[PDB]
Design a binder for this molecule. Structure first.
Ligand SMILES: [Zn+2]
Lengths: 81, 309
């Protein structure tokens, strides 16, 4: 169900795997928020990718068909001047 | 008496007449004409039948209107006009391409725009399509201000070129661009039909061949293979964390990032000599300058491949 809790996994560039408690109705915004709680990274620096596809803040995990035990990839935005 | 059109959105106009020599700002407030802040200028013949943009202190209706035609809320609109004022970077021509002088941490804009110059684009919004045509004619100032505002970029801050490209492609009509994918895991199997920006932009590898041949990404099970079974796109950008200096096959242009945190973007085109771009300067190619982050492909991007089942 849309409000039922599940785990997803976030892989970082540092080799680390975050475990998150999410609901399919959570937005990508929400997920990024949870990643700040756990990893101290501000949401606006985070780039979440599923299998090569970048994930939009306003859409939900349900929208993307991301289901329990799924693996996301996290990278930070680059800083070139 | 000079006749002008007043607007906030570029769609709904009001006709007003002005008296020659009146200062625009004293009559109308903060106003722009053809991208230029004309608030302090005087009303001339020159402005006859031209369009003047107001932008401050908008009603709910006006905000909604500019949300349609620009994609902006009130804050993005203020940033847009501020960027037009503050981002007057010198544009330098080199053959068929233009680039920017190094200024206010703009290398990510420089390389994103150098890449954009290889592709054709149609835009959903008139405002953006007009800015694009200006960009095509060697006048990128208006497009740059739209993108920076739209994307919430901060002025004079090192930023990310994939993001700049991405803001542009999200405003484009890419409705025919398809890419069909199969994700092979031991935990489960998934198929995806990506459309639009999801089809023309791929993250996780620089190499188009990796999508065709299939390539492994980290999962929680034994391994996840990402594999393209059908591709039909006008162009393709493959992006990744700056990790490798090895240029894949068939690349047309590419961005490179050098630094150990904060860093600097350069550009390369794969022409008959091969050109390397650093700000407004061009040079013979002598290898990668940092690591590849974005890689543009153009040719033969209509393909079907065998499924892996
Ligand atoms: Zn798996």
């Amino acid at each position: 169900g849309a409000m039922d809790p599940m785990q997803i996994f976030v892989k970082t560039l540092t080799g680390k795997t975050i475990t998150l408690e999410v609901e399919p109705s959570d937005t990508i915004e929400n997920v990024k928020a949870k990643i700040q709680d756990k990893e101290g990274i501000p949401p606006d620096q985070q780039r979440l990718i599923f299998a090569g596809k970048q994930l939009e803040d306003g859409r939900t995990l349900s929208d993307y068909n991301i289901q329990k035990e799924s693996t996301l990839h996290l990278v930070l935005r680059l800083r070139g001047g | 008496k000079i006749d002008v059109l007043l607007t906030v959105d570029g769609v709904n106009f009001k006709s007003i007449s002005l008296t020659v020599g009146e200062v625009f700002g004293k009559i109308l407030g903060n106003v722009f004409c053809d991208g230029i802040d004309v608030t302090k200028l005087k009303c001339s013949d020159f402005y006859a039948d031209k369009i003047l943009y107001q932008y401050e202190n908008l009603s709910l209706a006006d905000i909604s209107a500019v949300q349609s035609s620009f994609g902006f809320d009130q804050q993005q609109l203020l940033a847009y006009y501020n960027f037009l004022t503050v981002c007057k970077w010198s544009v330098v021509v080199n053959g068929p391409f233009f680039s920017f002088e190094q200024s206010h941490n703009n290398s990510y804009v420089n390389v994103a725009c150098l890449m954009l110059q290889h592709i054709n684009l149609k835009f959903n919004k008139w405002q953006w399509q007009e800015a694009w045509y200006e960009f095509r004619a060697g006048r990128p100032h208006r497009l740059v201000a739209l993108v920076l505002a739209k994307g919430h970029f901060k002025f004079d801050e090192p930023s990310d070129a994939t993001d700049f490209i991405r803001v542009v492609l999200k405003q484009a009509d890419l409705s025919g661009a398809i890419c069909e994918l199969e994700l092979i895991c031991d935990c489960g199997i998934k198929q995806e039909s990506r459309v639009g920006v999801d089809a023309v932009m791929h993250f996780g590898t620089l190499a188009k061949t990796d999508l065709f041949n299939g390539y492994k990404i980290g999962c929680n099970c034994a391994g996840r293979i990402v594999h393209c079974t059908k591709l039909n796109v006008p162009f393709l950008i493959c992006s990744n964390t700056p990790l490798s200096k090895d240029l894949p096959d068939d690349v047309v242009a590419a961005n490179m990032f050098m630094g150990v945190g904060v860093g600097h973007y350069t550009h390369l085109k794969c022409g008959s000599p091969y050109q390397h771009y650093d700000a407004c300067s061009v040079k013979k190619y002598t290898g990668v300058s940092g690591c590849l982050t974005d890689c543009l492909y153009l040719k033969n991007l209509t393909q079907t491949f065998t499924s892996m089942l």
